[PDB]
Amino acid sequence: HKCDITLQAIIKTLNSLTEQKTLCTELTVTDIFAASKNTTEKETFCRAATVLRQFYSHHEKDTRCLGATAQQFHRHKQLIRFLKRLDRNLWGLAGLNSCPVKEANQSTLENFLERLKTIMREKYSKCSS
């Protein structure tokens, strides 16, 4: 379950998420990676899934992100869709719903996703020859 193909599904979505820019990828999320100690692997996924869920739940209908042009509106919806897909996979990996996030530092969504991608790519690396 640890080196499950789900790792690839998460990476694929993160690749799409970071090659896509929005009017709000600069808005912030709690930096769960600002901890001088990321707990167990499952706990890290639960925390990442938690911060992303509050982000898309709070910005799906945000006037700052909805967009003026058809293209902006499309990218917004696309972003929300990808976040939900990423979140779904993370919760699946976490096998946990109740996890505390105490970090004060706020990082832009964009930087948070790049960081998560790095971590995910590392897991993939540790799983393969």
In a 3-state reduction of DSSP, which class is residue 28?
strand
- In sequence order, the 6+-apart residues with CB closer than 8 A to the CB of 80 are 56, 59, 60
The sign of the torsion formed by the CA atoms of 67, 78, 119, 129 equals negative
State the method: X-ray
| CATH code assigned at 6 | 1.20.1250.10
Contact (Cβ atoms closer than 8 angstroms) between residue 46 and residue 94: yes
Contact (Cβ atoms closer than 8 angstroms) between residue 82 and residue 110: no
**Could you tell me the residue range of the domain that residue 94 belongs to?**
1-129
**Angstrom resolution of this structure:** 2.0
Number of domains in the chain: 1
Per DSSP, helices labelled H in the chain are: 6-18, 41-59, 63-66, 70-94, 109-127
